Structures are given as structure tokens and as C-alpha cells.
Amino acid sequence: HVAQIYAIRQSISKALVAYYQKYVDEASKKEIKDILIQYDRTLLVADPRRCESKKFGGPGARARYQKSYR
Amino acid sequence: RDKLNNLVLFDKATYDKLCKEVPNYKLITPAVVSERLKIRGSLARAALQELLSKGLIKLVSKHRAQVIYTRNTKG
Amino acid sequence: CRFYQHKFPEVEDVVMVNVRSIAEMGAYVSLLEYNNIEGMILLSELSRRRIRSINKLIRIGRNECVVVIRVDKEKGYIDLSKRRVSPEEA
Amino acid sequence: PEKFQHILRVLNTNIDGRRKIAFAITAIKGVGRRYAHVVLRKADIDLTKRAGELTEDEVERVITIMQNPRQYKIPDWFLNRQKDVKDGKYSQVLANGLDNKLREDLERLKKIRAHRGLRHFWGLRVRGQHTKTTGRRGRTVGVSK
Amino acid sequence: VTVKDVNQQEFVRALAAFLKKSGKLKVPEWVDTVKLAKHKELAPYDENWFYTRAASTARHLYLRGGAGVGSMTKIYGGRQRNGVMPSHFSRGSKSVARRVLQALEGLKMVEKDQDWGRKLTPQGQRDLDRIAGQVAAAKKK
Amino acid sequence: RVQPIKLARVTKVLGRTGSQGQCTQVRVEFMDDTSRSIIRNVKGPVREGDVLTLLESEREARRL
Amino acid sequence: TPDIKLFGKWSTDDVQINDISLQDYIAVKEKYAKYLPHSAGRYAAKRFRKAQCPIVERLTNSMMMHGRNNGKKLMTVRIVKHAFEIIHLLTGENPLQVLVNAIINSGPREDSTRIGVRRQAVDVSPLRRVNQAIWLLCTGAREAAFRNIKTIAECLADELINAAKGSSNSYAIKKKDELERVAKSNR
Amino acid sequence: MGRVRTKTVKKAARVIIEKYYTRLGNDFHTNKRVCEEIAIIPSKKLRNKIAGYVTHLMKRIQRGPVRG
Amino acid sequence: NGKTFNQVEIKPEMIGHYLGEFSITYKPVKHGRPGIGATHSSRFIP
RNA sequence: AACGAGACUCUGGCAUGCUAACUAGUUACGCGACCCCCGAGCGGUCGGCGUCCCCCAACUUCUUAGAGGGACAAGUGGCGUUCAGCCACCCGAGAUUGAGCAAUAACAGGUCUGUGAUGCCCUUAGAUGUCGGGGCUGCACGCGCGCUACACUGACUGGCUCAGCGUGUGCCUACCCUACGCCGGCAGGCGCGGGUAACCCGUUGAACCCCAUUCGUGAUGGGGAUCGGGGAUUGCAAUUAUUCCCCAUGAACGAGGAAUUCCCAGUAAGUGCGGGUCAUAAGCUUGCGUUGAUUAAGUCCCUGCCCUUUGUACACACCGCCCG
Ligand SMILES: [Mg+2]
Ligand SMILES: [Mg+2]
Ligand SMILES: [Mg+2]
Ligand SMILES: [Mg+2]
Ligand SMILES: [Mg+2]
Ligand SMILES: [Mg+2]
Ligand SMILES: [Mg+2]
Ligand SMILES: [Mg+2]
Ligand SMILES: [Mg+2]
Ligand SMILES: [Mg+2]
Ligand SMILES: [Mg+2]
Ligand SMILES: [Mg+2]
Ligand SMILES: [Mg+2]
Ligand SMILES: [Mg+2]
Ligand SMILES: [Mg+2]
Ligand SMILES: [Mg+2]
Ligand SMILES: [Mg+2]
Ligand SMILES: [Mg+2]
Ligand SMILES: [Mg+2]
Ligand SMILES: [Mg+2]
Ligand SMILES: [Mg+2]
Ligand SMILES: [Mg+2]
Ligand SMILES: [Mg+2]
Ligand SMILES: [Mg+2]
Ligand SMILES: [Mg+2]
Ligand SMILES: [Mg+2]
Ligand SMILES: [Mg+2]
Ligand SMILES: [Mg+2]
């Protein structure tokens, strides 16, 4: 649910900047891009984060099961 | 653990205190009325709704989790 | 109900306190010669010499006489001490 | 609002008058909460009034439903005692009928000394549970002699 | 306005209040003594739960015209708490989902389409969009 | 038995002292007479240039 | 108006910070005005990057704690929203300034490290001030509402209020001054 | 990080400069092509690191002489 | 049983139960004294 | 000069550039059809909703997967004996993604119960090489890996709306995943199609979460042990209850002493879903996504590790040796 709010929020603004850049002048889209990128990045540049893969030994990716010495 | 005593329906003294507590408060939530009076809380909700039906209070935000009121939106 | 002619104990008085919780940098103890405003004794002030286990000195529910050193007579901070007692005062 | 009597003594047990009537009558044994809602629904009673807000005639309407469920059209798969082992009836044992029916069932089992009767006797676990590391009531034992 | 134009909860309340305003739509006899799924622990509070359930069922048929009972019981599945063991996903009740779809065919709002399944009749969609506009006009949407 | 607060600005970070290397050595100014200077030992993550707060400007700690 | 932003309702530009030590480490005005306390925000990737994070989002992140809340953030935003709405009633003042006050008056400006029980006194860095104040006043709330009829929004609100004016009736202040007296003794 | 070029990267880059010195200019993307033409580097990753040390050495050799 | 045949006279109340349900496969336990490994403290021999 | 390190191989992140797709699509209109006026209009036309039906339309943005491209401490500024390199910053999809593979010398480590790998010893027709029954589950007690909880940052009842890795008819062996209709409150039953699989289950209507209702600080509707009664499925057979469903019973437990485990970013934790075993069948394990923090950018204090110098009466090597 939440990871689609950011997909939408990034896609529409990445669109209004390519409808300008193609069918309007160039120097008008430089206004959009700086009103946009100065407020919050990742309205044009996607997050490169993806889940890491579990490994044997622990429940998730970095934890490990309990160790009982004695 | 102790015995937080609470009533499920009013007695005349408490009913008077309800129809007179309205101005005294700038924060009217079920919890605060259930604690300052000896009210179960399912009774405070009904009483607050009853008052709100009388325009005596003003509802400022209602949520599934928490409800609030205000004094009169006056003064 | 109050025990004595002043509700806040004065500095340099020996008080009867029932230790209640051993804190991380002290202990939160009741007040029993005055009304139950909290008290905090610093762990640096139980005994004059090195200690093997705190449960051998203080444990919940043990009346003991301790001396207050400082107090914010306004905010309510009763600073308490045990190194500084003779068994006659007790 | 509604300052008349609240507590009521339904058969052999003290039903507190404060709780919502559904969760009020559950203080009867043999009557859980899923059965109680059905009883109250078939009794037409409102489900937003506490036990204190019912007069002396609705309560009989509810009792007679709890006691004779089969006839108020509560199906035969709600009743806690089914094809009763000694006589084939279907019913809800209510208050001490539950105690006596458990008592009679354990006696019935021990009488022919079935493997469950002996487990009830010796005071152990009757279903198939392991018992090596569970239950564990008794006192610690030492290796010293 | 269509149905996607309006808030999908008050629309459901309106459709339920309308369905229970025609006298049609026969309800099953056991409507008041049923758990409603394998994983629930109680019977529904709202005495009119069949009307709400039929309303939501019709709406769901509108948005995806090929359901059949084996998905009404998935659309309505939930989470079962197995006592002292971890929970698990569990389906709805087949029997009430079946009797809901059957009760809607009696209003001529539903019909068994080609292949297999169900969809709304042309006359069902009108009945929906009308109260959709009713909702949009009441709440000013 | 009564002293006002003082506000210093960090001018250089020296090293991370303490037994577990927890506290940090730091050299500070004094923001009213920038001539003064002491060496102090802070507990959080100091950067450079940010305004500390001293409750007794007279001390000058010298190790762990 | 469109050059200026709100948490739906509350204004930022009327705020003030009076501790010149904390002006670098509380973000509220200007380029730190955001519409919601919820951003993806790869803040915890470098050392000081956490200082750029809008203070209301930091107040949210530090609230989902003790196990059966890890991750549930939308609940936290709906809690904070309600807390501020209550604060505006109990005072009639701007909620953001009260938050800034309750953060400033909870950072212990001196703590005691351990060397050997033998301690020593040290001063706390300006970043640890806010990092401790947040922890303290979010623990006060979570603690005051664990088996009471009050709701966490109510307790968090009255905590922020009783702390923004140091009152000895709030967990944060008690613990701060008590952490400072222990340092004062073994100076 | 690291970024300490191994002796198999610091020996290619030393032979290449001796043989082809008049091609190896001072930018990286042209050297990345010259090195790919002259020698046989059996990877892209290694080719880039070799061509990236070549540029360092070239910048240094436009001052006084280097001892390899 | 697993080694013996145990006699059982059939009563009417045994109806619908199983035969094996009247002939248990083990002796009921009653405990001895704990041995030399019984407690985490118990292990030591010179 | 050789090995190990590194290089290497797989994987994650970027291409609106290439190759090219009824077993993936999108946009268009050829469409047409349904529906509402929901807006100009009137209702069509202008438009709006479509996992409604088409195209012998156009293309490859989304999907799939091949070839190449890209990142080099390369640029700029400091610190470096101006070397090897470190620090910050710019442009950027990214300036430290995660695994596999791994040396010399050893250990009286584990495994003869994986092997038609195997020496010696034993038993070999009254068998230590087959059928029927019982046991590995037995309970005064000590310990280990775990699951569910002690509630209001919650439980219950409705309503709303989102995935990714996968497996699937069995060669003796003899069984697969399931759509859609009907019957039953529920587990389940009957009927009749698809699938040897980007084709069918399937647009995988997953849980937490989200929105609205009841309860009210009370071992309470928290918690769900223990126990009574009844109904189905698997199988040759269910008792010491295989599993599953319903009514009923309603224990300890109010955040846990001394101690002690794991963990640095899509990580800890919460949350569900596939694989393995599997006639029936996870409180396990191996993977997958989903909501997603607090604290650090350090040190040699504790437990250990690597390199140099130094001391030794030790070499089975300090768990050593040795005096009355
Ligand atoms: Mg996980
Ligand atoms: Mg849980
Ligand atoms: Mg790679
Ligand atoms: Mg990919
Ligand atoms: Mg489609
Ligand atoms: Mg490639
Ligand atoms: Mg340089
Ligand atoms: Mg950039
Ligand atoms: Mg790597
Ligand atoms: Mg090795
Ligand atoms: Mg072997
Ligand atoms: Mg052998
Ligand atoms: Mg054999
Ligand atoms: Mg056998
Ligand atoms: Mg075993
Ligand atoms: Mg293990
Ligand atoms: Mg629910
Ligand atoms: Mg088994
Ligand atoms: Mg699993
Ligand atoms: Mg299976
Ligand atoms: Mg399985
Ligand atoms: Mg296993
Ligand atoms: Mg070394
Ligand atoms: Mg030597
Ligand atoms: Mg030597
Ligand atoms: Mg020797
Ligand atoms: Mg020896
Ligand atoms: Mg020795």
C-alpha cells in the first residue's frame, strides 16, 4: 500500500517534466525540475533499495539463532 | 491493583455535574470525563454524544481511535 | 497524615526510610519519618569500602536511618546518604 | 437514567446486573458466549441494555429458552450434550447438570476401567500429550545420600 | 457519475439501505445463528448483516465481472488465530456466499455468464450508478 | 556555590579518549572573550564549530 | 500562501529557537517545512545526516517501540496529529513551538561516564541533547498510558505541555535533572 | 573501500606506457579505448582499472621522470 | 499386551469402545532416587 | 618465482538506445456494446467508467531476455617525505549491494546406522538374513532451541484495498494443482471442465496495515492451557485421543532474580506466503516479499585474534611443571 503511494507520487511528476520537455520549450522545464528537486528528491530519482536475501543460520538476513554455550 | 469504581448510568448529582461541566473544560474527551467523574467510559461516550446533540459542545475531531470536543468555540 | 512539625526534612537530619527500588545510579526509597515524598540515595554512598553484591547491603523493605545532604526545597529532590551515619544516631 | 434494581439471581448463580446482558448471563456454567447470543436473539431482547434494565418477565422468556432450546428452533448442533450416551437425548446441561454430567461420565469411564478412566484416577494427562517435560507440579529432588 | 467516482464505504451503506427497502431479496432462514466463517469467533453484530453482505457482493461483481462462489469466499477470507500456534490465512463460508449470489439473481441484477461465474445484468449496473449519483449528490461529491 | 552558565564553541577535535573510547577530547573558545581556551571531554558525537554548554568553566579535564 | 507549508494546519514560520547551541540540530523552519512527517529518507547512511531530518518525523520514529509496534508508522502519524490537536486546546498556543520548548528543556547539559562504580562528569554534545530529550519524553508518554484509561495521544500531549514549562510533574524533566545531580556529586 | 591497486594492475600500466607512450593522452575515456586495442585484458573491470592507473602515471610523467 | 494375554470379561457398558482400551501396554511409573547425572550440579568423580 | 588475498563466477541497482514478441502488453481508433448525465449538450454528438468484444491497426514505455554500454578514486579542493594513498565535494542510476569459491599443516573432531566403498573380529538354520502385537510418546526431577501471552500503541464485529520467490498428473511406485455448478452452519460431499504449464488454478482479491462499531483498568470480552459431549476426511488399522469442525470448561501469566544471546540500512523487529518431509500433516527448517525504527561511524576495557621484541625449569606444550 505505502510503496505504491511513492510510485504514483514519483510517476506523475516525472511526467509533467517530460510533457514539458517535449512539447514546450526547454527553459520552461528547468523551472519545474528545480521547483521539484529542491523540495524533495526521489520525485525524479528512484530509490535503489531492495530487500536483501536471507541466509541459513538465522531467521532473516543478518540475525542468527541463539547460541547456548553450557 | 485496586477497585476503580465506576457507574454505568448516572445519579442525579452526577447528571447535574454533567450539564454543568461543559464550560469548565477546554478539552472534552471520553477519557477525561471518565476519570474526573466516576464513569465507566461506555457511559461517558453516550453522555457526550447526548450533549453534542444539544449543541452544548463542539466536535473538533472524531476518529475510530480517539474523539475530542471543545468548549463552545466562543470566548 | 504528617509525622512532624515540618513536612520537608531539613539538611543534616537522620530519617527513617524504607528502601523500595535499587536504581541504576542510586535507590528510590520511601520516606517514613516524613510523609512519603520520594528520596534518592546515590550508589556511591551505601558504604565506605568495595561491595560484592548490593542485595547484601540494601533490599526492598528494610527500615534504615539515612542522612539527607541536599534538597531542592522547591522542586522536591531529597538527596540521601548512608556512609555518613554512627549507630548511636540510629 | 434508570435507577432501579440491577443484580438478579438467575438459577443458582448470581448474575451481576452491570454487564451487558449478553456478557451478563455468561456467568452461568454451560452457557458460553456464542450460545448466549443465540438465546438472546431468539428471545427478541435488545442487545444494548445491561442486566439491570430488564424487568421480571423478559428474564423468564430468556430462562425458558436456555432450558428448552430444541423447541425454540435452536438447531441440534449447538447443544453441548448430544445423543446422550445413556438415553439418546440432545440438550444443554446448564448449572449443576454440568457438574453431575462430568461426574457421571468419569464414573462411567472408571467403572469398566478404560484406559482413560485409569488416567483420570492416577491424575495424569488423558489425551496424547508427552509428559516428560510438562505439568511439572512437584518438588525438587537432590542427588545427595 | 459511475461507482469509481464515489467513496466505496458510504456507497455500500446506501446500497444496503436500498436493498433492504424493496421487500424482495429473500434471506436464508439461518440468518441469525451463523458464524459467517471458519475463522471468526462470534456472530455478526449488525442484525441486517445479510443486506450489507449482498450489497458488497454486488459491488464486487461490478468491478470484476466473473467471480463465482470460490472467490467470494476468497474475497472474504481472513486470519485465523490457532490458539497457541501461529495464525494462518483462512477462507469465508461457501454456503452463505452461494445463497447471496442466488438471492441477487432473484432481483434480476445478476446472471450466470458464458464460460462459468457471475456478472451484473445491464439492469443491475443502472441500479448501482443511480445510487452512486445519489451518494455523490448527498455528500456533494 | 553559584556560577552562571557558559557557552563555548568547539574549535578542534583531538582524539577519542575513555576506556571504551567513548568520550571525545575537544578544544573550545568562550564566545564572550575569544581569547580564552580550554580542553574538555564531551560525551556525544561532536563535529566542529557547534556551541557546547559548560556548567563550570573553571575545570579542565586531563584524561579518561 | 503557496510558498509556505503546514502539517495540514499548523504554521512553521512563526516558530523561534532560543538555545543557539540547538539551532543547528532542530529542523523546523524554511527548507525543512514538509507537509507530513513521513518521508523515505535515507538519513541513517552517514554520520551527521540525522541532523537534517525534520524534528516532527524524528518524534514519530522514536514512538513506535517496544516490540508490538515495530514498523507500524501510519499509526504513529495519526497519533502525532491528534496530540498536536489536543495541545492547541490545552494552551491556545502553536503546537510546534511547544514541541520545540519541550525538546530544549529536556536535554541534560551534563552527564556522568563510568571509569571504576566510580564515575566522572562530562558534558554532552549538542546532538545528544536532542537525541536524549526525544527518548525521554516519548518514554514518559508510553509509560504514563500503559494501564490507564487515558489514550496515548492524551498522555503524549500533556507530557509535551508539562515539559515545555519545566514542572517536576513530567517524566522527562525529573529524569534529566536527576541525571544531572548524579553528575554534580561526583564532579 | 580500499582502492589500493594490485601489483597486476601496477605492472600492466607500467609496460603499456613504455611501449605506447604517444597514444596515451591525459583523459580517461580515450585511454580506456587505446588500452583495449593494444593489449588483451580479459575483463571489463580489469581493463578500466589498468586504464585508470595509466592516467595517473601520465599526469605524473608530464612532470619529472618516474623510476619505473 | 505385547507379551501376556490379559483376560477381560465383557460388560454391556464396554459397547462401542475398543478392545485394546482394556489392556494397557506398560507398568505405571513410580520413581526411584535420582542418579549421578540427574542435576547440572551432580557430575563429578575423581 | 609458486599458493592464499585480489582478479574470477552468480546476483541487486541504470538505459524511453539495439534485437522482438496472439504463451506479455500498451496507445489508438475500426470498432461496436453497457451504463449513467456525471459535465457542453438533451439523452447522441463533446466527454466520463470497462480485466466488455473485436483489428489482417501502430509500436515495445510497462512484461519477458539476449548482445553491448556504464565506475575508474576518473574531475575539483585540502592532507601525504608530494610516492603508496586518505578526507570532503561536484556530475551521477551508483563513489562502501549480497553470496559462491579458498592456502600450508593439522584434529586420535563426526560418520562402519548413506554406499554392491572397506581390513579384522562375531553370528550363520534353535539366526544377528521375514509376519502379528508392543516400544522409541512411558514421569517425582535438572537443562537446551522455541511458540503463544500478560492488553487501550488493545480485543471483537463489519467495510475497503495492495505482493514476491515457487511447486503442479509419479518411469517400479501408482498420488498431482484446481476452476465453475449444486448440496451442508462448519469440516466436507457430489457433478463436470482446464493444466505435462508465461497457455489452467491466477489480474495469485495474503496478513499486518487502513476506515467505521461494541467493551472500559476489572484475571475483564486480555490469555487460551486442561477437560466433557458430538460430526467428517486419510488409511489395511486412529485406543496411548493422526489431522479437521461445533457447543461447552476457562489454569498459570499483571513485563520476568543471578546471568546471558543476536544485531549497523531496506538491516533489527512486526507480518503473512511458497519449497523440504508429505497416504493424512508444522509450534521446524530453507527461501520470498510486505510495514519498516531508535543508537554508531568508535575503542582495546572485557572475551578473543594477527605481527615484532623479550622471559621460561613448559614441548602430552599453563588444562604445563612442581615444593614441603
Ligand atoms: Mg524478517
Ligand atoms: Mg502477534
Ligand atoms: Mg557485480
Ligand atoms: Mg532486474
Ligand atoms: Mg485489460
Ligand atoms: Mg550484461
Ligand atoms: Mg589530487
Ligand atoms: Mg547528485
Ligand atoms: Mg563485494
Ligand atoms: Mg585455510
Ligand atoms: Mg562411512
Ligand atoms: Mg566393516
Ligand atoms: Mg525384510
Ligand atoms: Mg514388525
Ligand atoms: Mg526420540
Ligand atoms: Mg541448535
Ligand atoms: Mg478483524
Ligand atoms: Mg506422527
Ligand atoms: Mg515456512
Ligand atoms: Mg502436500
Ligand atoms: Mg507442508
Ligand atoms: Mg526436523
Ligand atoms: Mg597483523
Ligand atoms: Mg625467544
Ligand atoms: Mg625460547
Ligand atoms: Mg621436557
Ligand atoms: Mg600430565
Ligand atoms: Mg596451574
Tab-separated table of N, CA and C in Angstrom, chain H residues 14-67:
chain	number	residue	atom	x	y	z
H	14	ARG	N	52.532	-0.163	-16.319
H	14	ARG	CA	53.919	0.229	-16.487
H	14	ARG	C	54.504	-0.236	-17.802
H	15	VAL	N	54.138	-1.418	-18.280
H	15	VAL	CA	54.621	-1.837	-19.593
H	15	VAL	C	53.954	-1.036	-20.701
H	16	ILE	N	52.642	-0.839	-20.585
H	16	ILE	CA	51.887	-0.152	-21.624
H	16	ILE	C	52.473	1.224	-21.893
H	17	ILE	N	52.819	1.958	-20.840
H	17	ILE	CA	53.341	3.299	-21.050
H	17	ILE	C	54.677	3.249	-21.753
H	18	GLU	N	55.514	2.269	-21.429
H	18	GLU	CA	56.785	2.153	-22.126
H	18	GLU	C	56.569	1.921	-23.613
H	19	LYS	N	55.738	0.942	-23.962
H	19	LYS	CA	55.553	0.647	-25.379
H	19	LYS	C	54.781	1.751	-26.092
H	20	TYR	N	53.554	2.025	-25.659
H	20	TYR	CA	52.717	3.059	-26.268
H	20	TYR	C	52.707	4.263	-25.341
H	21	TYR	N	53.582	5.222	-25.598
H	21	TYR	CA	53.520	6.448	-24.827
H	21	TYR	C	52.879	7.587	-25.589
H	22	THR	N	52.964	7.573	-26.910
H	22	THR	CA	52.456	8.668	-27.711
H	22	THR	C	50.962	8.583	-27.968
H	23	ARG	N	50.332	7.453	-27.677
H	23	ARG	CA	48.881	7.400	-27.742
H	23	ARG	C	48.248	7.841	-26.437
H	24	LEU	N	48.815	7.423	-25.321
H	24	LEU	CA	48.169	7.589	-24.029
H	24	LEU	C	48.140	9.063	-23.686
H	25	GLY	N	47.008	9.699	-23.919
H	25	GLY	CA	46.914	11.111	-23.650
H	25	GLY	C	46.710	11.367	-22.176
H	26	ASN	N	45.758	12.221	-21.837
H	26	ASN	CA	45.545	12.632	-20.465
H	26	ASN	C	44.108	12.496	-19.987
H	27	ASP	N	43.171	12.057	-20.832
H	27	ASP	CA	41.817	11.791	-20.381
H	27	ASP	C	41.616	10.293	-20.249
H	28	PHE	N	40.566	9.916	-19.533
H	28	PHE	CA	40.407	8.518	-19.174
H	28	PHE	C	39.655	7.737	-20.236
H	29	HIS	N	38.684	8.358	-20.896
H	29	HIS	CA	37.824	7.591	-21.784
H	29	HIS	C	38.501	7.269	-23.106
H	30	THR	N	39.517	8.035	-23.500
H	30	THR	CA	40.280	7.671	-24.689
H	30	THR	C	41.301	6.593	-24.368
H	31	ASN	N	41.926	6.686	-23.196
H	31	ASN	CA	42.846	5.647	-22.763
H	31	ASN	C	42.134	4.321	-22.587
H	32	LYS	N	40.902	4.355	-22.082
H	32	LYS	CA	40.109	3.145	-21.923
H	32	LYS	C	39.887	2.415	-23.236
H	33	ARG	N	39.999	3.114	-24.375
H	33	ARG	CA	39.909	2.567	-25.733
H	33	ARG	C	41.251	2.167	-26.298
H	34	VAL	N	42.293	2.958	-26.081
H	34	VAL	CA	43.634	2.615	-26.541
H	34	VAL	C	44.102	1.335	-25.867
H	35	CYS	N	43.932	1.252	-24.547
H	35	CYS	CA	44.352	0.062	-23.818
H	35	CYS	C	43.590	-1.159	-24.288
H	36	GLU	N	42.302	-1.024	-24.565
H	36	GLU	CA	41.517	-2.125	-25.105
H	36	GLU	C	42.001	-2.579	-26.476
H	37	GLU	N	42.549	-1.679	-27.282
H	37	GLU	CA	43.073	-2.040	-28.583
H	37	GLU	C	44.430	-2.717	-28.472
H	38	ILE	N	45.340	-2.218	-27.633
H	38	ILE	CA	46.737	-2.639	-27.726
H	38	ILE	C	46.946	-3.992	-27.071
H	39	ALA	N	46.441	-4.168	-25.863
H	39	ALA	CA	46.667	-5.383	-25.106
H	39	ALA	C	45.378	-6.182	-25.010
H	40	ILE	N	45.494	-7.390	-24.473
H	40	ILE	CA	44.333	-8.245	-24.275
H	40	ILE	C	44.041	-8.372	-22.791
H	41	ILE	N	43.138	-7.543	-22.283
H	41	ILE	CA	42.731	-7.587	-20.883
H	41	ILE	C	41.448	-8.407	-20.802
H	42	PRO	N	41.457	-9.557	-20.166
H	42	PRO	CA	40.318	-10.481	-20.214
H	42	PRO	C	39.176	-10.140	-19.264
H	43	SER	N	38.832	-8.859	-19.181
H	43	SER	CA	37.690	-8.439	-18.377
H	43	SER	C	37.457	-6.960	-18.596
H	44	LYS	N	36.241	-6.515	-18.307
H	44	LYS	CA	35.973	-5.086	-18.340
H	44	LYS	C	36.482	-4.415	-17.073
H	45	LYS	N	36.218	-5.028	-15.924
H	45	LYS	CA	36.622	-4.441	-14.654
H	45	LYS	C	38.128	-4.227	-14.594
H	46	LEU	N	38.905	-5.204	-15.049
H	46	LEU	CA	40.353	-5.045	-15.031
H	46	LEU	C	40.816	-4.017	-16.049
H	47	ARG	N	40.198	-4.008	-17.229
H	47	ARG	CA	40.560	-3.033	-18.246
H	47	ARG	C	40.413	-1.620	-17.719
H	48	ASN	N	39.319	-1.341	-17.019
H	48	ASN	CA	39.133	0.010	-16.526
H	48	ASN	C	40.150	0.386	-15.466
H	49	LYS	N	40.509	-0.521	-14.568
H	49	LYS	CA	41.476	-0.168	-13.536
H	49	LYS	C	42.862	0.049	-14.110
H	50	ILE	N	43.234	-0.749	-15.104
H	50	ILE	CA	44.505	-0.536	-15.783
H	50	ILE	C	44.513	0.819	-16.479
H	51	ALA	N	43.469	1.106	-17.249
H	51	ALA	CA	43.387	2.388	-17.917
H	51	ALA	C	43.205	3.532	-16.955
H	52	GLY	N	42.888	3.262	-15.701
H	52	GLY	CA	42.753	4.327	-14.731
H	52	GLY	C	44.043	4.604	-14.003
H	53	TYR	N	44.915	3.604	-13.926
H	53	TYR	CA	46.264	3.866	-13.436
H	53	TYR	C	47.129	4.506	-14.505
H	54	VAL	N	46.869	4.187	-15.773
H	54	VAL	CA	47.633	4.798	-16.852
H	54	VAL	C	47.513	6.311	-16.793
H	55	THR	N	46.329	6.813	-16.463
H	55	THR	CA	46.130	8.254	-16.433
H	55	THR	C	46.888	8.901	-15.284
H	56	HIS	N	46.871	8.273	-14.111
H	56	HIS	CA	47.690	8.757	-13.009
H	56	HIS	C	49.145	8.862	-13.429
H	57	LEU	N	49.671	7.797	-14.030
H	57	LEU	CA	51.079	7.793	-14.401
H	57	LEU	C	51.378	8.845	-15.454
H	58	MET	N	50.463	9.061	-16.393
H	58	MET	CA	50.609	10.074	-17.424
H	58	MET	C	50.655	11.461	-16.832
H	59	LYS	N	49.724	11.805	-15.942
H	59	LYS	CA	49.763	13.092	-15.239
H	59	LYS	C	51.081	13.257	-14.513
H	60	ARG	N	51.611	12.197	-13.902
H	60	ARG	CA	52.874	12.327	-13.187
H	60	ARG	C	54.051	12.493	-14.128
H	61	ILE	N	54.007	11.864	-15.298
H	61	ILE	CA	55.141	11.915	-16.211
H	61	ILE	C	55.217	13.233	-16.967
H	62	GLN	N	54.145	14.000	-17.066
H	62	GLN	CA	54.235	15.354	-17.600
H	62	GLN	C	54.923	16.332	-16.630
H	63	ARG	N	55.368	15.866	-15.455
H	63	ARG	CA	56.412	16.489	-14.627
H	63	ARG	C	57.746	15.743	-14.835
H	64	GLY	N	58.606	15.643	-13.826
H	64	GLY	CA	59.860	14.928	-13.896
H	64	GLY	C	59.718	13.431	-14.095
H	65	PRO	N	60.835	12.718	-14.293
H	65	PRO	CA	60.844	11.300	-14.628
H	65	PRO	C	60.456	10.408	-13.447
H	66	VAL	N	59.790	9.287	-13.736
H	66	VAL	CA	59.338	8.296	-12.764
H	66	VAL	C	60.259	7.091	-12.856
H	67	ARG	N	60.441	6.398	-11.736
H	67	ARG	CA	61.524	5.429	-11.575
H	67	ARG	C	61.095	3.999	-11.885
